A paper describes a structure:
The mono-ubiquitination of the histone protein H2B (H2Bub1) is a highly conserved histone post-translational modification that plays critical roles in many fundamental processes. In addition to the RING domain, Bre1 contains a N-terminal Rad6-binding domain (RBD) that also makes important contributions to the H2Bub1 catalysis.
We screened through several fungal species and were able to crystallize the Kluyveromyces lactis Rad6 (KlRad6) in complex with the Kluyveromyces lactis Bre1 (KlBre1) N-terminal fragment 1-206 or 1-184 (crystal forms 1 and 2, respectively). The structures were refined to resolutions of 3.2 and 3.05 Å. In contrast, KlRad6 molecules in the other three complexes do not mediate extensive crystal packing interactions. When the three KlRad6 molecules not mediating extensive crystal packing interactions in our structures are compared, large structural differences are observed for residues 90–98 and 115–121 surrounding KlRad6’s active site. The 90–98 region can be resolved in the electron density map in crystal form 1 but is mostly disordered in KlRad6 molecule 2 in crystal form 2, the equivalent Cα atoms in the 115–121 region are located as far as 5.2 Å apart. In contrast, in KlRad6 molecule 1 in crystal form 2, the temperature factors for these regions are not elevated, consistent with stabilization of their structure by the extensive crystal packing interactions.
Author numbering:
A (entry chain A): 0 to 158
B (entry chain C): 12 to 121, 127 to 173
C (entry chain D): 16 to 183
Write the structure that this text describes.
């Protein structure tokens, strides 16, 4: 049912996604559980993650938008700010949250991590040390995850 | 075979983005593999053509070594000149001559620090000029390879 | 066909076939870079060792030019001593190999090199050439990325999927 202030807003976010979905972004709450979202970011151009089909999983809380959601990459990843299980070390998801952030705002903020990773939090120590000194080998390794992302048939995006 | 832009994407629209992307990645690898076989043959050709050219020097050095063993005095050097003369595998001989070139030139003639410096400088002067020529050649032939594919795109219909 | 040739032609191909084709080229490219790296390594290791022998003939030529008498032979040693093209130098040595040994032994005694300027001239040239080789190889390294970028961006510019997802 959809009377809870949190659930009420999550449907408000969903409407925006259905009408002004950011470029290279997909997001759909589970048809029954409106607290778990399937998401999919496409790596922007002129970034080593270019043309990747990276799947995300957004888990929300009853306090939203006052509390950030849990965000996990589902596709395999190689990013300085992505832990080995998919959990993203993003600022707006940790200590710089805000109720003016809907789903789109969070998926584009994760999208922007592709072009410029935050060097402050090395979740992936290898990815961080590659991106800072050996950039040519960095792009070589990022593209191997871009290739893997294509394997999934995007069944999570059907109706 | 796609859908409307100002709309959320579809399972069909992303499968079509993956296939078109899989091809572009396929093509990027295909062009990288073809450029390398052209360089690999020119490398394997030039690698054989360089080993063939040493036989002029090696044969001329062995005869010059044999000419002086009868008048050579130091037995560790006499044994060394013999070791040089009696090596049949030419790969061994070329390094034995390259690695011990300073010892060789002195033993044939019978200042010494000048020889070590002119041999170090001449070998490097020769090595670098050839290495630069092949690098400039690898650069010249590679630019031609890619611009062939570029021209087929700049006019394709 | 086994492998598709155009971006238009891939809509009919299933994904499992496109992946099988991509890997065959990706794996062929990795074997070829290893082959290209190890080959270019062995080509430099051989040019240093061929120059080892070649230089020893040049050094013996420089040592005996002062006591050679007939100038048609001195011109031959001079032509030999001052060339830096190994194909040129190796032909000169292969074609006249016995003559060289004759001129080396014909000289009565070992005679001292008279010019340190050629060693400084080579020292400066040695440094200039090392600088030119690195810059030439760098011109090639950045170009491989540069040309592969423009070729790939032509496929992107003509793509229907890319223009749908990102173009505003």
């Amino acid at each position: 049912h959809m009377s809870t202030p949190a659930r009420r807003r999550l449907m408000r976010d969903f409407k925006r996604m259905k009408e002004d979905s950011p470029p290279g972004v997909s997001a759909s709450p589970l048809p029954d559980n409106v607290m778990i979202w399937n998401a999919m970011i496409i790596g922007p151009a002129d970034t080593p993650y270019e043309d990747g089909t990276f799947r995300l999983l957004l888990e929300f809380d009853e306090e939203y938008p006052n509390k950030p959601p849990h965000v996990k990459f589902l596709s395999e990843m190689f990013h300085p700010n992505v832990y080995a299980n998919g959990e993203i070390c993003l600022d707006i998801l940790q200590n710089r949250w805000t109720p003016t952030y809907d789903v789109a705002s969070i998926l584009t903020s994760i999208q922007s991590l592709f072009n410029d990773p935050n060097p402050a939090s090395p979740a992936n120590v290898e990815a961080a040390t590659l991106f800072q000194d050996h950039k040519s080998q960095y792009v070589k390794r990022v593209k191997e995850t871009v290739e893997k992302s294509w394997e999934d048939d995007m069944e999570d995006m059907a109706d | 075979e796609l859908s409307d832009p100002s709309e959320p994407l579809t399972q069909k629209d992303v499968i079509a983005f993956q296939k078109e992307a899989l091809f572009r990645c396929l093509n990027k690898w295909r062009v990288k593999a073809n450029q390398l076989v052209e360089e690999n043959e020119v490398l394997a050709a030039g690698l054989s053509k360089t080993t063939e050219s040493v036989s002029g020097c090696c044969s001329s050095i062995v005869v010059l070594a044999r000419s002086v063993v009868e008048d050579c005095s130091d037995e560790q050097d006499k044994r060394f000149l013999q070791q040089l003369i009696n090596t049949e595998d030419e790969h061994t001989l070329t390094q034995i001559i390259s690695n011990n070139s300073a010892r060789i030139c002195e033993l044939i003639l019978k200042i010494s620090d000048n020889i070590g410096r002119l041999q170090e400088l001449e070998s490097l002067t020769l090595t670098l000029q050839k290495l630069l020529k092949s690098s400039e050649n690898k650069l010249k032939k590679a630019t031609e390879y890619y611009e062939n594919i570029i021209a087929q795109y700049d006019r394709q219909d």
